[PDB]
Amino acid sequence: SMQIFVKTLTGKTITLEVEPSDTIENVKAKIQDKEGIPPDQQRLIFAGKQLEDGRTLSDYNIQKESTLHLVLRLRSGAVQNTIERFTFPHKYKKRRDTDEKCTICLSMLEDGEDVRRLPCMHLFHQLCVDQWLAMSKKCPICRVDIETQL
Ligand SMILES: [Zn+2]
Ligand SMILES: [Zn+2]
């Protein structure tokens, strides 16, 4: 086995015990196992290109100690439209630790709740974080602008 690194926009780095013959889908799956991010929300970038799910790491030049970037899989204050364009709204599904709390209101996230992931990968209740973003388009935790790109 071997190890590779996955970095978010905050500089946070995750270590992944992988195989060279693992699919990008499997990589997103262990990212979900470690950090609870659904694979449909993850866009992995490596060397300035996007990484398709049905392909293997060893297709893509992923040796030991390689670092991929984990961006948000998207298609001053921010208006509601700006917020939707730069974040991932969804209903929460607890995965079978597994507990996550909205750091604004301190309540646990429950199945079905309207939640929002920001491009830094931080996750909140929609109701809690939209009030914040209408005041300042930065993440309350890490202060990353919801429009920053790369
Ligand atoms: Zn909340
Ligand atoms: Zn953040």
Author numbering: 0 to 74, 86, 255 to 274, 289 to 342
Authors' description from the paper:
Two related RING E3 ligases, Arkadia (RNF111) and Ark2C (RNF165), have central roles in the regulation of Transforming Growth Factor β (TGFβ) signalling. Both E3s are positive regulators of TGFβ signalling because they mediate the attachment of degradative ﻿ubiquitin chains and subsequent destruction of negative regulators of the TGFβ pathway, such as SMAD7 and SnoN/Ski. Previously we reported that the RING domains of Arkadia and Ark2C are bona fide ﻿ubiquitin-binding domains, and that docking of the RING domain onto a regulatory ﻿ubiquitin molecule (UbR) enhances ﻿ubiquitin transfer. Most E3s possess a RING (Really Interesting New Gene) domain that binds the thioester linked E2~﻿ubiquitin (E2~Ub) conjugate and brings it into close proximity with the substrate. ﻿ubiquitin is then typically transferred directly from the E2 to a lysine residue in the substrate.
